[PDB]
Amino acid sequence: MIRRETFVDDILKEIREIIVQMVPREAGITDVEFEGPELVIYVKNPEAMMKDGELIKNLAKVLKKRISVRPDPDILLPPEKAEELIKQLVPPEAEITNISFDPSVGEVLIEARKPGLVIGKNGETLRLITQKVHWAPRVVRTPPIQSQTIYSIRSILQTESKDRRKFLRQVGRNIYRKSEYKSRWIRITGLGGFREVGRSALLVQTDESYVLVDFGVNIAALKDPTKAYPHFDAPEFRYVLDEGLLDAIIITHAALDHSGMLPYLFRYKLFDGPIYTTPPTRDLMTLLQQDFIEIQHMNGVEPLYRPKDIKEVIKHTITLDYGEVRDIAPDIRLTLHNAGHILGSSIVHLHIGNGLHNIAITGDFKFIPTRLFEPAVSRFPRLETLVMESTYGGSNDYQMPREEAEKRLIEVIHQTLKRGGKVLIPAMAVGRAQEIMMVLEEYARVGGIEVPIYLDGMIWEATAIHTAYPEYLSKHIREQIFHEGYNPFLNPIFKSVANSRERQDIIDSGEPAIIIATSGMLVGGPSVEYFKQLAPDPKNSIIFVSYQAEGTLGRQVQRGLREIPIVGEDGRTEVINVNMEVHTIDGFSGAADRRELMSYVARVRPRPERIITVHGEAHKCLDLSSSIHKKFGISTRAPNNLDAIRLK
Amino acid sequence: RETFVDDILKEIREIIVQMVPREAGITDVEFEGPELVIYVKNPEAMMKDGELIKNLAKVLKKRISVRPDPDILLPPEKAEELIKQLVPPEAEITNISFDPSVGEVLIEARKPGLVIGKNGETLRLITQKVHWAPRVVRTPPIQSQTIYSIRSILQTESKDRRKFLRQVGRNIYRKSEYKSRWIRITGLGGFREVGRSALLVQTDESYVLVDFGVNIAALKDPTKAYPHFDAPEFRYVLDEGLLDAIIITHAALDHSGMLPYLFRYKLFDGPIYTTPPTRDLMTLLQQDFIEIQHMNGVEPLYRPKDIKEVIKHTITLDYGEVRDIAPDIRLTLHNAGHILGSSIVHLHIGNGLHNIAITGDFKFIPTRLFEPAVSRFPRLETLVMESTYGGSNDYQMPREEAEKRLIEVIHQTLKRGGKVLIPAMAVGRAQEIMMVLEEYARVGGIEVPIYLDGMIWEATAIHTAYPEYLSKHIREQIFHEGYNPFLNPIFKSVANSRERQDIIDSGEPAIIIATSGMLVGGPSVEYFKQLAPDPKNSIIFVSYQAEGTLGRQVQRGLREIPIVGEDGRTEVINVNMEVHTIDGFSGAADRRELMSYVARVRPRPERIITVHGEAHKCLDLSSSIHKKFGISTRAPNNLDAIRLK
Amino acid sequence: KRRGKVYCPVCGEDERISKVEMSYAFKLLLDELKAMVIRPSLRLKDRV
Amino acid sequence: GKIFTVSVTVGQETTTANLIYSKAKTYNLPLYAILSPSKVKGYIFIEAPNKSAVEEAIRGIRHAKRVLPGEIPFSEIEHFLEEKPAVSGFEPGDIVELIAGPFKGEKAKVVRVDESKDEIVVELVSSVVPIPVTVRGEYVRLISKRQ
Amino acid sequence: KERACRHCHYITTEDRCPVCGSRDLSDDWFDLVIVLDVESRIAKKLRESIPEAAKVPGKYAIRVR
DNA sequence: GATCATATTGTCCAGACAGT
DNA sequence: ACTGTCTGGACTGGTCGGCGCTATGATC
RNA sequence: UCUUAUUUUUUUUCUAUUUUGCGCCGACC
Ligand SMILES: [Zn+2]
Ligand SMILES: [Zn+2]
Ligand SMILES: [Zn+2]
Ligand SMILES: [Zn+2]
After folding, report:
1. Across the interface, which of B222, B266, B299 has its CB nearest the CB of D129?
2. Which nucleotide is closest to E2, CA to C1'?
3. What regulation of activity is recorded for this protein (chain B)?
4. Cα distance between residue A485 and residue A481, in whole Å
5. From the candidates D98, D112, D131, D135, which should be mutated to test the interface with B, based on the most B CB atoms within 10 A?
6. 3-state DSSP call for residue A58?
7. Burial code of A312-330, b = ≥16 C-beta within 10 A, e = fewer?
8. Residue D91's closest CA among A50, A4, B380?
9. Disulfide-capable partner of A624 in A138, A390, A451, A561 (CB 3.0 to 4.6 Å)?
């Protein structure tokens, strides 16, 4: 890491002085340090700290920082005694699955089925555990469905605890290198995704800190490195990367257009530092990068990056919750709000200065209440500059409501599965497939269907991540999970296929079933195999939910051509007669239409001084900006790539 | 970065030996600045006619400089005699100098038109008969110290200048004609503000700096006094040494004040392309700025050796001359008309990819001193325009009745035997006042002497040294006629304080042109102090007066101004002389002038960036242009990047 | 002369400064003594 | 093997060391080792069994003044023959003086220091506007340690 | 010209490196060290820092840039 | 050829001091 | 307490006139 | 079935007025 002025000694001394003057001397404060945006206090006697629950809250309010009180390594119970004490203390209904110990910092990681019982009301159990264990606890949710990605990430974090702690200490030292500082100037530059779709990249530059947002890659023009990669030739980006001045990286949501280029920096050691995001976004973006490099490897092209730099990105990732305010820079405070696009999608709120400026980068988001995700947060404490997507900002971009699309899907399933067919719904592993299966489960809740649903591909991992993070879902799903004893994702009608034997058996069985396999636009995977093995069957119907790129198999099927030429392995081409039935219901998309964007602009509080439209076509962005300016009078801009706009 | 200069030079030599006759004896072909230098052994067969040279320049798109190879060289003591015999005696040659390292002869003559030739054939004949490549410069009828110092610096540092020019030519032609992927305009200063202007043209290959200046008004605050050095793009450019060139629109402190600061800390080592009048006036103004900063007690911004380094790194470009300053960027300068050597910068990026016209300070109405601003370009896409007088109500009075009022006020002052004191800037309005007075006195209106004090003589000498940069009327008077308007016997210069005291004590009527409009320094304060108690005298203000200064105090009607006299005691100035304010001689474009320039520019630019003015004035001008003509107008703040292409 | 003010750099004292008439040889001797790491302190007295 | 010091003319210690090496090669001298660090100016070190061999080897060279009577302990010169970048030991916030480069004879303050690229970032204290510049780590010298 | 190897840090006048047999040569180097005896203490200090240096008598260096 | 860091470290009288 | 020895400092002032000296062995 | 962060207005000009030193030799009072 780079070396800066690092005036954190005076700040730490002031924090220690305030702690001494506030926390009673019976606690015996020993060490005070910074781990990322967190303040870590090691005390000799924690038995005189959490006797009143208001003390931690008052200390956090006074210091304006998140406080993680941990015991000193000297006062550490034996791991077996601590583990048995924790297991005996918690209620049996908590169902603690795994317990891991870190004696370097004295931190216990408790993966449990019900984290609420372990934490308790206002953390009253979480502190009290230390009162009998003298270990600082941290609770995570064990998903009901076993997830390979989450387990691998947790194992990597636990095995690399020393390197992770050193990296966190370095990040915390870099963040608080200065006191509360007011920036002289704030600007934002679009290295990608400005007046275009994909490969988004935002750079917020002040006189002290430089923050990168939503760094991603474009897959539509991957053959051309200029149109697929963000602008690395930008002088500000070159100056930041060469000098190592990138303080933080924030990912809006897990997608190739917002997180594809993240491992590229770590592969070539271009940037090292913290990547702030939400845990679902981190897990889903790791899965997306893994499948992207798998696709690149199978296509015969050189892969963009290896899994090792993906693991490095995992080790350099800091997870934040919704509504949590954290210090990522001496002058910038980062908050993540609900977006409603996908699981873990976060609207970024950057508060720069002591009320000097506020920037809201929505990214991809939805305003209507979806069946799986809550509507986007349209209320902020302060707002001066708003950055919003313009993917559907056209004049005629008025999608049909979700009720009509749900009714169409339900009636299509009804008229197709009564003839013994098998409906195939190719969709992205992170996108609208989860909404589709939620709708199918809700329809099956009535009792009108008993067919199985097979989650071929990586849909099982996404569903497992969704189960592991139910607090990021919609209000109805959160209610049904927490205050009621039933899981919609744990329906017995959902089945998982691991290898080709089960999928071939269910293809050749002839029993009615619903197959949801991920291949993008049928570019490769289980979905193309299902289509090839179900092409001669005329009693089944295929469903297309996403846009079909030209020159792909999905577009060829949607065009109605009855002779699809498909290449095959070991030479030759597999060309066969197709009796598939094609349906197109583009209503489950997680992208807000023009009406939703205008409603979000109207209902946002407070009204921003300026609105910047990005992440969409040039004509769409210009039309949306002109419409907003004509309707509300807000000074709107639609800048192209490499455009710096000075805010304050 | 990689360089393909060797391959380009090899292909240029191949084209030359394909086209240029073999008997000419081409030995070396190299790059000097933006020009291509070819050394020959037989110049007689090289330039039998100018058609071959013109065809070579057109095909290669280079400024061809054909010089004899240093293997053969006539002795200087004989070359001087052959040059004197060859040049007609009508052209008074004042100095002849020889550079033998690279074969060159500099001829400083009073009439360069006869030395250069009717169509340039005299230079070819001279370098054929004497085997010395000629370069002709003008001898100023009024001697100038700054121009002589610049010439001496360029002569005594021929080795360093040649090495710098060779490295600049190597850096410029590192690659062939390159189509830039993107073009960006960034404002490090002068955006929505007055002063400390700085423009950055950024491509994927080259970066160009434009009119790096300083803010005199906000000199107390370092944040506003200087262009933003904390810009990441500027930091990247200066850190990696990617600044290809620096272009100065016109010689002023808000456009060239911070130029020697880069050379003071070795932040820049490339060339500075500007017109010769702009160069000399910029060095004069920088020297004056350093002197008053050193007098005021604050630490000077830079040393005079930094100004000398700027002179050594300055490349002179005439009006209408297109030169390659970057692998994708060609630069030309047109007549801005604001001051002497003021140039509108036309940057042609790519092969028709984009064209930027930075006007800077300019004047559109035809003034007596200078020609109107050039409104015609071969191609125009982006127009960066000043907005100093961009307000709706900003309407300067016309020049004709303003000069009539000035002339009649001077006549009434001299009728009663008083003295006329005219505080003015060092350049700009002062020489316009001199021209108006000379025109009035040429018909016999006034026979009193006119005294120029406080560096106005230096500016007048610099103006005389470059008459081709003046207006059409002055060019006609100087070249075709034998009368020089600046060389009138009425114009007199002082030598010391004794002559100033003699002028003050003289009872005859006279006109005195001071040096400071604010009466802050120079002989203006002394003249005001010694002429204020006399009621017959008068003072005429031709420029805006700043609050807190002596000029504004005496303009506001204060009949008794208390000032700090000698012995640390307050002495009052009893102002009984008449006070007049005629501010119609400003060299900045009026709002009507800006609107006329926008309407009459050819071709119509795709976008207009309103800079160099107050934020409200810039916004008003941009809105007015957008509402009137429909052109997309922007008035961005500092640290704002606009992607043109 | 540029600032136009007389002040003592070792001490400050922008007010209590007095003009003393003496030989330039004595000033040279004082400079030599200061160069020899010897500090001569001139205790000024009124002429009357 | 004992370490002795040979005083030479400043700026040409390497030339004198090469001359001594050539003399030892072509004259059969019992010289064990010769060291000439670039940081040390005007002196070189010679590992030899005795000082007599040192003064005999340096004899006949006009650029070798004398040999110091004392013997240098090996711990004093142990740090000289150690692989360590010149940027090590430099922390931001102090004041340094730039020995060479375009900013010759200038004092500055360290802002950023990295050892991978063997370079350091310094802001000139005499500059009114803060403009950081990069300079080689071996081109600076610490004048006062501060944070 | 004068060039120093980057692997064994040997100083040689010609292109070939006759000690380590590598094809990397650097034009910039400091800290000339002369080795005449194998057992000499500074040669041992060079060996523990650079395992492929101070193998034969000649010229060496600690750092190459 | 034109530059550039370095360029070595006679007598007599009077006061202070080891020696017996 | 005496006695020979080592060390340190000064050696009248002024004037006229002249003579002559105050870099060099590497480096590109 | 869940913890510990914050938020907003009062400083001005495009620039200026008589070669020492060192040392030698000779001569005079
Ligand atoms: Zn997106
Ligand atoms: Zn200007
Ligand atoms: Zn004092
Ligand atoms: Zn080697």
Report:
1. B222
2. G28
3. Transcription termination is stimulated by the Spt4-Spt5 complex. Dipicolinic acid inhibits FttA-mediated termination in vitro and inhibits growth in vivo.
4. 7
5. D131
6. helix
7. bbbbbbbbbebeebbbbbb
8. A4
9. A390
